[PDB]
A paper describes a structure:
The sortase family of cysteine transpeptidases catalyzes the anchoring of a wide variety of virulence-associated surface proteins to the cell wall peptidoglycan. Sortases, unique to Gram-positive bacteria, recognize and cleave the C-terminal cell wall sorting signal motif (CWSS) of substrate proteins. In the genome of toxigenic C. difficile strain 630, only one functional sortase, the SrtB gene, is present. Recent studies have demonstrated that C. difficile SrtB (Cd-SrtB) can recognize and cleave (S/P)PXTG between threonine and glycine; however, Cd-SrtB cannot recognize the sequence LPXTG and NPQTN, corresponding to the recognition motifs for Sa-SrtA and Sa-SrtB, respectively.
Author numbering: 29 to 161, 168 to 209, 217 to 224
Write the structure that this text describes.
């Protein structure tokens, strides 16, 4: 078990989160907290003006090979139809490494929910597709519904959770393992 600077910072932020401190004041790019059931994915999510900045920058905007979990710069509101979050596949089993657990059929069968926590509100998304291999914007419902069909059938396993254009979707992607939730 490796204790290094990255693992320390992230466990401290988890604690500030539990002590309900305002993390915006540490980094104005903070958007919400993210956790995934039955994993150690339990991190802060930030947003830059691009999809690159926080690849190599910790929550304090110092260098880090762990980066910070960040949301696609195109995302606007919690009501976006696909909220996309990116994070790394770290070797010490941190960040988005545990997305791999969704490779396990039985694990997948279970209902592990993705939990966005924002402004004292909890948004639960039920995972319904996972696989190894990205749109935030849809011009209308047709494109959307096609996106849903597209990613539903890319799933390694058929989900008992069914999904359509009246649901909102979250997408946890590594930067290649990928999973989609539905609200």
């Amino acid at each position: 078990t490796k204790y290094n600077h990255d693992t320390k910072i992230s466990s401290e932020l988890q604690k500030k989160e539990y002590k309900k401190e305002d993390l915006s004041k540490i980094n104005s790019d903070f958007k919400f907290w993210l956790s995934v059931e039955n994993t150690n994915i339990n991190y802060p999510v930030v947003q830059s003006k691009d999809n690159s900045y926080y690849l190599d920058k910790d929550f304090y905007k110092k260098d880090s090979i762990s980066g910070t979990l960040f949301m696609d710069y195109r995302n606007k509101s919690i009501d976006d139809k696909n909220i996309i979050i990116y994070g790394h596949n770290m070797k010490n089993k941190t960040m988005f490494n545990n997305l791999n657990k969704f490779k396990d059929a039985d694990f997948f069968k279970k209902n592990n929910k993705i939990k966005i926590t924002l402004n004292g509100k909890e948004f639960l998304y039920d995972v319904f597709s996972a696989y190894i291999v990205l749109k935030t914007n849809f011009n209308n419902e047709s494109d959307y519904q096609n996106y849903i069909n597209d990613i539903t059938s890319k799933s390694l396993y058929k989900s008992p959770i069914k999904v359509n254009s009246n649901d909102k979707i979250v997408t946890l992607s590594t930067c290649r393992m990928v999973i989609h939730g539905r609200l």
